[model samples]
Target: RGIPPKIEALPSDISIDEGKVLTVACAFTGEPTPEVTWSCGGRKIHSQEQGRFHIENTDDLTTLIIMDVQKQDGGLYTLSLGNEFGSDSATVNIHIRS
Candidate 1:
C-alpha cells in the first residue's frame, strides 16, 4: 500500500501587531508525519532564518511553527507533505499587523 497524506488545516492564531514579533504555527493532520516544509510565495524558507521553523509530530496531527514573524513573512505558505507514496500542499496568506 502506498502512503497518501493530507493536510487537515492551518492554525488561525495569527495576530495583528504594529511591530511586535509574532509566531505563526501551521497545524496539519497526515500519516507518516510528512516532510513538513515552509515556503513563502514560491521561495523555500531555510531553517537558519531569523525566525524559528520546525515540526512537531503527534499521533493524530502535526504542528509547524514559524517564530518571530515579520512583514516579509506575508505570502503563500506552502506546506508540502509527502513520502515515497505521494505528496500534498496547502497555501496560507499572511497580512501585515495593525
Candidate 2:
C-alpha cells in the first residue's frame, strides 16, 4: 500500500535584509518518498549544492538556500510534491527588510 504526500511543516514567512542569506524549508511524509520541486510563480527552480543558490533534499525535508537576498528574490517560494499516489504543494513568502 502507498500513501499520498502530506505536508507536515512549512517554513514561516521571512523578513530579511538585502545581502543576507535566505533559507526556506518544507517537510513532508509519504510512502516510497515523494519527489521535491521548488518553484517561484510559473518558473521552475533547480537545486545546487554550491553557488548562489543551493537546494538540498533529505528523506523527509527539502531546503532552498539563497546566497544573497535581493529585491527580485523577495516573493513567494512554492514547494511542490508528487508521489505515485498524488501531488501536494505549499508556499512561503519572502519580505525584504530594511
Candidate 3:
C-alpha cells in the first residue's frame, strides 16, 4: 500500500450503438488502495445479479460489464472511487444510442 491513491480511466467518453455491449475499466496504483463503484443515471451498480449490469472489482482492474445496451442506457456514466486517504468522484462520462 502507498498514499494518495493515484488512478486513471480510459475511453474518457464512449459512443456505442444500441444492443451492443462493452466493458470499461479503471486502473489504479497500490497507493493506499481504493474502492471501485459505478453509478449511472442516478442508480448504483454492483456484482449481485447477472443481467443488464455487472461489475467485477478484481485486483488487476474494475470491470464494468454492461449488456443489453438500449436508448435508456444512453447517458453519461460516472465512476466513484474512494480510499482511506481520500475519495474522488466525477463524470468519467459516456454516451450510447440506437
Q: Tell me the whole-model lDDT of each prediction, alpha carbons only.
A: 0.60, 0.86, 0.70
| TM-score, cand. 3 vs. native | 0.80
Worst 10 residues of 3 by lDDT: 1-10
Colliding residue pairs in candidate 3 = 2-32
List the RMSD of every prediction in angstroms.
3.4, 1.4, 2.0
Backbone clash tally (model 3) = 1
Model 1: weakest 10-residue lDDT segment is: 12-21
Superior by lDDT: candidate 1 or candidate 2? 2
lDDT of 3 by residue, 1-98 (tens): 44654456556777777888767777764455677767877888776595688888765477777787777766667777777777666565557765
How many pairs of residues collide in each model? 0, 0, 1
Point out where model 2 deviates above 4 Å.
none
Worst 10 residues of 2 by lDDT: 44-53
Q: By how many angstroms RMSD does model 1 differ from the true structure?
A: 3.4
Better structure of 2 and 3 per TM-score: 2
Q: Judged by lDDT, which candidate is best? A: 2
To one decimal, what is the Cα RMSD in angstroms of model 2 from the true structure? Answer: 1.4
Per-residue C-alpha lDDT of model 2 across residues 1-98, encoded as one tens digit per residue: 99999889996688889989988777799887999888888888886656777888999988888988788888888888899999899888889877
Model 3, C-alpha of 3: deviation from truth (Å): 1.1
**Candidates' TM-scores?**
0.65, 0.91, 0.80
